[PDB]
Design a protein around this ligand. Structure first.
Ligand SMILES: CC(=O)N[C@H]1[C@H](O[C@@H]2[C@H](O[C@]3(C(=O)O)C[C@H](O)[C@@H](NC(C)=O)[C@H]([C@H](O)[C@@H](CO)O[C@]4(C(=O)O)C[C@H](O)[C@@H](NC(C)=O)[C@H]([C@H](O)[C@H](O)CO)O4)O3)[C@@H](O)[C@H](O[C@H]3[C@H](O)[C@@H](O)[C@H](O)O[C@@H]3CO)O[C@@H]2CO)O[C@H](CO)[C@H](O)[C@@H]1O
Ligand code: NA
Lengths: 219, 205
């Protein structure tokens, strides 16, 4: 591949701020035909990507003037002169000078800034319904936090448990710009019944101490 | 308006193949190469290949080790992508892209050995605001729909994207709110298995 290196990978901004996104190729994108095949796409959450800029600087149909692209050779820049809400999403650069293979940058997520918010953490022992069937999931929600970086562990009687964990996260909330996460630890009933203490442990910017929610199996 | 209408979702076992279609309207089908790109579960974009629909010439990303074959039917303005010997690494959303300008709506491919499987739905009451939860475990395929009190609790809800593990999906949702004085029920549907279930969240005894 002609490797496309996009920076930053994450770009928190306020609505109305400008934005600048850079993309560098591992060799020149000038084609023997004189064109330079460097394009920029936006993918809004849950949708297909859409073309914004083709051949370095050409605005595609319907793309507003606040988007402009520039650059040459190996160094390119996408500028957004005033970020609007509809602009939030993931931007990808791509080259099609050297095909095959056409290649993409890793993406830059244009995200809304907001004040720090500590996660609201809730832990749930296995339902009696699940246990009657021989399974045991422990669930932990870590909701409405900002910024997005967070660490989450399960501890069982003080030991880290990695095996049997499934995590999922929501995209940044359109309404309150926070992030939420779920972590689910699944054990057999028999294994669940040979430990006492279950803990969902997080670290986040908002606390110097870990954020802990725990229960003991017997109540 | 250029439109690219892709075929519906695919569910296949490891080692099987898929054949995805893309029906183009509103531009010159033979005037642009049809490209194919997938978006991996990690969200990276990965180009598979391109076909010139006029002469039928193709180019491919060698990463696919010849497993992908592109074809067109000019009689129906339809481009096709066949991908063989599937593994879980091929679970992705697949796009056709006309001239790298217009994108189709995507076709999901999920590689799993599971047959249709109804979820188990478990109410999650708090340890002995309030936050309650519902765990929707062990189902196949996507999607499910989940609501709280039939949609009457919508604020303070977080329903998480399902995650595939050992061939089946698990989703969860939380609702933050009083209770237990007023009833709170999670309503779960899984169309594929004709499952509709309601689970009342009861305090733990
Ligand atoms: C083999 C090669 O050099 N590949 C180049 C390619 O070169 C162009 C010609 O290649 C073909 C091809 O793909 O094989 C010929 C096809 O017949 C033609 N398809 C048509 C007409 O439907 C196809 C297109 O020109 C295609 C590029 O692949 O153009 C477009 C597209 O329609 O899809 C144009 C879009 O604007 C562009 N999108 C954006 C956003 O910019 C897309 C996009 O880049 C691709 O879809 C990505 O996959 O591409 O091209 C090649 O035959 C030709 O060379 C001729 C000389 O021009 C001629 O003077 C001499 O006598 O014979 C040569 C051999 O036939 O050169 C064409 C470029 O000028 O260009 C690609 C550019 O993306 C790429 O560089 C690829 O490596
Ligand atoms: Na513990």
């Amino acid at each position: 591949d002609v490797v496309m290196t996009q920076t930053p990978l994450s770009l928190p901004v306020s609505l109305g701020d400008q934005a600048s996104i850079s993309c560098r190729s591992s060799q020149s994108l000038v084609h023997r035909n004189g064109n330079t095949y460097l394009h920029w796409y936006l993918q809004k959450p849950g949708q297909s990507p859409k073309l914004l800029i083709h051949k370095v600087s050409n605005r595609f149909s319907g793309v507003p003037d606040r988007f402009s692209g520039s650059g040459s050779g190996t160094d390119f820049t996408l500028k957004i002169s005033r970020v609007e809400a509809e602009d939030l999403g993931v931007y990808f650069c791509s080259q099609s000078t050297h095909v095959p293979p056409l290649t993409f940058g890793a993406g830059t997520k244009l995200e809304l800034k907001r004040a720090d918010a500590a996660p609201t953490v809730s832990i749930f022992p296995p339902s009696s319904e699940q246990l009657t069937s021989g399974g045991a999931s422990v669930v932990c929600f870590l909701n409405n936090f900002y910024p997005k970086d967070i660490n989450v562990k399960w501890k069982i009687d003080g030991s880290e448990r990695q095996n049997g964990v499934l995590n999922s996260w929501t995209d940044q909330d359109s309404k309150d710009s926070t992030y939420s996460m779920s972590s689910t630890l699944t054990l057999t009933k028999d294994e669940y019944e040979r430990h006492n203490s279950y803990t969902c442990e997080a670290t986040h910017k908002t606390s110097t101490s870990p954020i802990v929610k725990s229960f003991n199996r017997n109540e | 308006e250029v439109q690219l209408l892709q075929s519906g979702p695919e569910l296949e076992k490891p080692g099987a193949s898929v054949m995805i279609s893309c029906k183009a309207s509103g531009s010159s089908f033979t005037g642009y190469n049809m490209n194919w790109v997938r978006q991996n579960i990690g969200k990276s974009l990965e180009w598979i290949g391109a076909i010139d629909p006029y002469y039928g010439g193709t180019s491919y990303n060698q990463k696919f080790k010849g497993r992908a074959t592109l074809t067109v039917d000019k009689s129906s303005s339809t481009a096709y992508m066949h991908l063989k010997s599937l593994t879980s690494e091929d679970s992705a959303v697949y796009y056709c892209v006309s001239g790298m300008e217009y994108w189709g709506q995507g076709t999901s491919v999920t590689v799993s050995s599971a047959k249709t499987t109804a979820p188990s739905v478990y109410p999650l009451a708090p340890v002995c605001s309030v936050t309650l939860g519902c765990l929707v475990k062990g189902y196949f395929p996507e999607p499910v729909t989940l609501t709280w009190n039939s949609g009457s609790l919508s604020s303070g809800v977080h329903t998480f994207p399902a995650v595939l593990q050992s061939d089946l999906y698990t989703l969860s949702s939380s609702v933050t709110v009083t209770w237990p004085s007023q009833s709170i029920t999670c309503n779960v549907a899984h169309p594929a298995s004709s499952t509709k279930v309601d689970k009342k969240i009861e305090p733990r005894g």
